């Protein structure tokens, strides 16, 4: 594995993780 | 609310893959600093 | 129990920030070992 | 960013994460 | 479904320990590269 | 702490984390 491949996989997983946190945080506000 | 847990799980799965990637990097760096430390010692 | 999920989320948000900080450190160390490896090579 | 700033942010986030785990673990015992 | 949250929590607790271990390694590597950087400078 | 001890603790925690993700993912499929 190459460090630039590492940089690519890290960035994608972080973005995905952030979008999932937004999803959850909104489905709570739809109730609470 | 079961929709919620399926999303809580998806976030955990994403962080599980991030952790495995950080562990990979730490192992690589540890091997590289060790090779440098040994080089300076052999000289 | 919706109070629970709001707390499960808060723990995940805290670990999300911890991961970004570890990634920062790994990148810094990788650049520093590379500069050392190149130095020893140039000598 | 400075490595001592890094040490400070890491320690705060770990403590916060630990206190949140205690919170959740108790709200379960109040039922189960 | 409370059984679920108890399992969501257990996964978070496992990742909390993984993070503390990665932080440990990053601190170790940072100290080792610093000692090398200082060595090359003192020479 | 020794780096080989570190390797041992990391691997155990990853395996445990993976088995917990499988547990959760199945208890959802038993419903949804």
Numbering used by the authors:
A (entry chain B), D (entry chain B), F (entry chain B): 41 to 72
B (entry chain A), C (entry chain A), E (entry chain A): 3 to 45
Please quote the paper that reports this structure.
After the binding of the gp120 to the cellular receptors, gp41 undergoes conformation changes after fusion peptide (FP) inserts into the target cell membrane, exposing N-terminal heptad repeat (NHR) trimer, and forming the six-helix bundle (6-HB) structure. Peptides derived from the HIV-1 gp41 CHR are potent HIV fusion inhibitors, which specifically interact with the viral gp41 NHR to form heterogeneous 6-HB to prevent fusogenic gp41 core formation. Our previous studies have shown that AP1 and AP2, artificial peptides with non-native protein sequences, could form coiled-coil structure to interact with gp41 NHR and inhibit HIV-1 Env-mediated cell-cell fusion. To elucidate the molecular determinants of these artificial peptides, we successfully solved all three complex structures of AP1/AP2/AP3 peptides binding with gp41 NHR.
Here we designed a new artificial peptide, AP3, by adding Met and Thr to the N-terminus of AP2. However, a similar strategy failed on the crystallization of AP3; therefore, we decided to cocrystallize the synthetic peptide N45 and AP3 peptide, and eventually the complex crystals were obtained. Interestingly, the crystals of three different inhibitors belong to three distinctive space groups: P21 for N36-L6-AP1, R32 for N36-L6-AP2, and P63 for N45/AP3. As expected, the N-terminal Met and Thr of AP3 forms a hook-like structure. The hydrophobic methionine side chain of M41 accommodates the groove between AP3 and NHR helices, capping the hydrophobic pocket. This interaction leads to a series of conformational changes. The main chain of AP3 at W43 moves 1.91 Å closer to NHR compared to AP2. The side chain of W43 in AP3 flips around 90 degrees and is buried deeper than that of AP2. The side chain of E44 turns back to interact to D47, but the E45 side chain turns back from K48 and interacts with T42. Therefore, this M-T hook structure could further stabilize the binding between AP3 and NHR target.
